[PDB]
Amino acid sequence: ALPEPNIFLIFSHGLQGCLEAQGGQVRVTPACNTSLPAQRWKWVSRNRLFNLGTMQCLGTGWPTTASLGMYECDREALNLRWHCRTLGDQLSLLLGARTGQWRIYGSEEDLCALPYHEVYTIQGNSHGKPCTIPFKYDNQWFHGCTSTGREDGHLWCATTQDYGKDERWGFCPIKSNDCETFWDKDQLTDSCYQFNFQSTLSWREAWASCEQQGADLLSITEIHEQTYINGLLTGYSSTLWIGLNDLDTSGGWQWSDNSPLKYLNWESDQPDNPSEENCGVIRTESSGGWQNRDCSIALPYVCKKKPNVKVECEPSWQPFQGHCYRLQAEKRSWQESKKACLRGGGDLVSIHSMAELEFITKQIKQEVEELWIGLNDLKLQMNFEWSDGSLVSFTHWHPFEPNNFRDSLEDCVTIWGPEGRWNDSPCNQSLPSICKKAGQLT
Numbered sequence: 065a066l067p068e069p070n071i072f073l074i075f076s077h078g079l080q081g082c083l084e085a086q087g088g089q090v091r092v093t094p095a096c097n098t099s100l101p102a103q104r105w106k107w108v109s110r111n112r113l114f115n116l117g118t119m120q121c122l123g124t125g126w127p128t129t130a131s132l133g134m135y136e137c138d139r140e141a142l143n144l145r146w147h148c149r150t151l152g153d154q155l156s157l158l159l160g161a162r163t164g165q166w167r168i169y170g171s172e173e174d175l176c177a178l179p180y181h182e183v184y185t186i187q188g189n190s191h192g193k194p195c196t197i198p199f200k201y202d203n204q205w206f207h208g209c210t211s212t213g214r215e216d217g218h219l220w221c222a223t224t225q226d227y228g229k230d231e232r233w234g235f236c237p238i239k240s241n242d243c244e245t246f247w248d249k250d251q252l253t254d255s256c257y258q259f260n261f262q263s264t265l266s267w268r269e270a271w272a273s274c275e276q277q278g279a280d281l282l283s284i285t286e287i288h289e290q291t292y293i294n295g296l297l298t299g300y301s302s303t304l305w306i307g308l309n310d311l312d313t314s315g316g317w318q319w320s321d322n323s324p325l326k327y328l329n330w331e332s333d334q335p336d337n338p339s340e341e342n343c344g345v346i347r348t349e350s351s352g353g354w355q356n357r358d359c360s361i362a363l364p365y366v367c368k369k370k371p372n373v374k375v376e377c378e379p380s381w382q383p384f385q386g387h388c389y390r391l392q393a394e395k396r397s398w399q400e401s402k403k404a405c406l407r408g409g410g411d412l413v414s415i416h417s418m419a420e421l422e423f424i425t426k427q428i429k430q431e432v433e434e435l436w437i438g439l440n441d442l443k444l445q446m447n448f449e450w451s452d453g454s455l456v457s458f459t460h461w462h463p464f465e466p467n468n469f470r471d472s473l474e475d476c477v478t479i480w481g482p483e484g485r486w487n488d489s490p491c492n493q494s495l496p497s498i499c500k501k502a503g504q505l506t
């Protein structure tokens with residue numbers, strides 16, 4: 065009753081038929097049936113190929129002549145290791161059927177198309193370790209998660225090959241549209257948050273774990289969210305992976321869920337070691353301050369999820385998507401640039417999309433190296449807003465920007481270079497600027 069997106073049938077274009085396991089052996093049947101467990105296969109851990117009909121793994125003898133067999137996935141006493149690049153050639157050699165490339169049935173994609181992927185456990189006693197697939201529990205083999213032995217229905221898996229022996233397990237990640245049972249829900253935003261305190265995972269592993277849940281590593285986009293996160297941290301002493309990273313080498317600091325980085329909680333001396341230490345953490349010790357750390361260390365992590373044109377203008381301004389834009393060539397401070405924009409019925413430009421950024425960069429800015437745009441923290445330090453009051457829906461920062469937020473109390477934002485990435489600057493730098501205003505529909 066649980067779906068099997070990674071299960072496939074194995075089709076020999078030479079023998080015109082599917083690989084089937086019954087009796088003790090494996091043969092080709094010209095009759096291909098996608099519903100017959102005996103014909104259904106999946107890659108599992110340690111290069112093993114699992115058959116649903118037998119609940120066993122394909123094998124051949126160690127270096128005594130060849131053949132092919134179905135064996136309990138425990139067995140050291142046969143070679144169960146298969147590599148998807150060579151699997152077809154091996155089936156031809158060991159099958160013995162005298163007459164051809166092997167592919168996945170019906171899509172004809174090659175046998176590497178559905179690799180085994182590790183699935184990180186949630187809670188349990190295993191600190192986040194992936195499911196061991198397959199695993200024995202109470203003398204049955206499981207090729208995936210199961211609700212058996214558990215009456216609340218939740219899917220779980222063993223993190224050891226033998227559960228009766230080691231009793232190590234964890235819950236399996238769910239892709240869900242609600243927050244039930246694994247999440248705290250903020251009543252105000254309907255955002256859901258998961259604090260895996262008992263888990264030790266690298267940033268990439270923790271990223272993958274949140275993705276397996278239909279979620280992402282925590283982003284903190286506003287002061288209320290920081291505050292609500294600190295409230296959930298109360299009573300704990302911990303350092304947890306969050307979504308903040310500079311890993312993209314062309315850009316600056318960013319959230320992996322691509323929220324704007326408009327709000328900054330960095331600790332006083334952070335970020336440091338710009339070379340390595342590419343991934344962010346939240347610390348209870350600073351009550352929610354952020355650090356950048358080496359991405360390969362194993363830490364607890366936090367996951368987050370949400371269950372959620374023609375125009376014209378006055379001369380010297382140019383249309384884009386119902387708005388109008390123009391360059392102010394005169395070099396001025398950010399404050400005086402805004403005043404100049406307001407004298408022409410507009411504000412310093414706000415940028416809500418990459419398309420809008422590209423029009424601005426290529427059509428308006430053109431050869432001008434650096435110029436003021438509307439983003440700034442003047443109202444409340446560390447919290448960036450557009451001067452025109454529209455929402456900040458995305459950021460594009462140059463590498464290691466923004467760096468000016470602690471040393472300049474008044475921190476403003478430019479556009480620099482041909483790609484249209486942003487810098488932050490003390491607001492008193494004298495630069496050209498760009499104005500935006502609402503256009504007139506024709």
Ligand SMILES: *[C@@H]1O[C@H](CO)[C@@H](O[C@@H]2O[C@H](CO)[C@@H](O[C@@H]3O[C@H](CO)[C@@H](O)[C@H](O)[C@H]3NC(C)=O)[C@H](O)[C@H]2NC(C)=O)[C@H](O)[C@H]1NC(C)=O
Binds near residue numbers: 492493494
């Ligand atoms: C943008 O703002 C900056 C900071 O407000 C300006 O830099 C400041 O310039 C001041 C004047 O040069 C310095 O003040 C003091 O000036 C006397 C003059 O005789 C010197 O002796 C002092 O040494 C000097 N103060 C110190 C501590 O050395 C400020 O120190 C200096 N501040 C900084 C942080 O650099 C920029 O000039 C201003 N830019 C524009 C374009 O307006």
Ligand SMILES: *[C@@H]1O[C@H](CO)[C@@H](O)[C@H](O)[C@H]1NC(C)=O
Binds near residue numbers: 096097098099100
């Ligand atoms: C496949 O197997 C099922 C047995 O559940 C059988 O009812 C069905 O007719 C078979 N179909 C084909 C095309 O072999």
Ligand code: NA
Binds near residue numbers: 335336
């Ligand atoms: Na650090």
Ligand code: NA
Binds near residue numbers: 466468488489
């Ligand atoms: Na800067």
